[PDB]
Design a protein around this ligand. Sequence first.
Ligand SMILES: *[C@@H]1O[C@H](CO)[C@@H](O[C@@H]2O[C@H](CO)[C@@H](O)[C@H](O[C@@H]3O[C@H](CO)[C@@H](O)[C@H](O)[C@@H]3O)[C@H]2NC(C)=O)[C@H](O)[C@H]1NC(C)=O
Ligand SMILES: *[C@@H]1O[C@H](CO)[C@@H](O)[C@H](O)[C@H]1NC(C)=O
Lengths: 197, 140
Amino acid sequence: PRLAPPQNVTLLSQNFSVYLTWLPGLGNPQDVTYFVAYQSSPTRRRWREVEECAGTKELLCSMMCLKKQDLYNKFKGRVRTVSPSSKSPWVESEYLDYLFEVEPAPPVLVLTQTEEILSANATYQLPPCMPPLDLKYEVAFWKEGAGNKTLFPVTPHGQPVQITLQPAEHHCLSARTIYTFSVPKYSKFSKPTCFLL
Amino acid sequence: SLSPQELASFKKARDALEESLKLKNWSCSSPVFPGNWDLRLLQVRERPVALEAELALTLKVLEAAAGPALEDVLDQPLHTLHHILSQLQACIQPRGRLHHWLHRLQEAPKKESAGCLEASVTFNLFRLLTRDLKYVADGN
Ligand SMILES: *[C@@H]1O[C@H](CO)[C@@H](O[C@@H]2O[C@H](CO)[C@@H](O)[C@H](O[C@@H]3O[C@H](CO)[C@@H](O)[C@H](O)[C@@H]3O)[C@H]2NC(C)=O)[C@H](O)[C@H]1NC(C)=O
Ligand SMILES: *[C@@H]1O[C@H](CO)[C@@H](O)[C@H](O)[C@H]1NC(C)=O
């Protein structure tokens, strides 16, 4: 019984990275594996195997910083179901175009506190192969009780956000990333950091 | 750093070129750009020269793209490319990597088909605009 292909094969970006995900083949047994491949650079193009997801039992595969991967151009992934003595047809994803489709992660806020100056600085753990994206961030600040929040101006990754305080309980900081290539993309806000004062 | 409108313009051109290349046979006997093409492999002083060479090659090739449809979509991209080139040249200033890389790009138009050259510079376009331009602007 030939093995039936994966379903809803989807190549997507999340947190600066790219993932291929899929669902099990209709008629299949559990206890099957999957093999994944991707296209190399358009001018030296073939399907290459992802070593990490060779015979994986998972339903996803990280598709970032792969060998011979060109993120400045479109690329597809493919998945096939594999069991010994059998293999399904490949199922390809749609092209993903990283510069235009990457989804930014929230920053990690580095916090310092001078007597009356609260400083928030955005840091990122970026895939080592990532193109040099232009990243900015936006801090939200609020008194844990009093509802109204203050949104500070968009700040380039690399500059801190300075916040002047008022003697006045818990106070809170959050930040989101804005990435603009052709069309602005916003991350969710980071997990708030709340502290006593 | 390129604007959204400019990048939208390049994308529209790049995609139009890609589509036209699906109708052509554009195989290369040898790829146009080196497999490890990256200005970081070069001395800082050599980088602008490398960047100039790929810019000139890109212009040469795209300015020859055939048919009204492509000329139309390439019109504004060619204009932005001309401006980037000219700005680069107003900032500019024994055989090794730079020399060999320069040779490869100069010789390519003589040895390869039009489709092949068209394919090469189109697929090189966003790396050029995004990576190569930035590294040069940083190192100065
Ligand atoms: C606020 O946060 C930003 C972002 O993290 C800080 O920028 C980084 O801070 C230092 C600057 O030298 C470095 O961590 C980053 O640059 C790099 O330093 C490493 C260590 O040698 C090397 O890879 C290079 O030297 C590289 O330049 C730097 N990032 C950038 C984009 O400059 C920033 O310092 C911090 N606060 C302040 C006041 O800058
Ligand atoms: C893809 O999967 C989704 C949800 O799993 C489903 O709704 C959709 O029908 C699938 N696509 C096709 C073409 O069947």
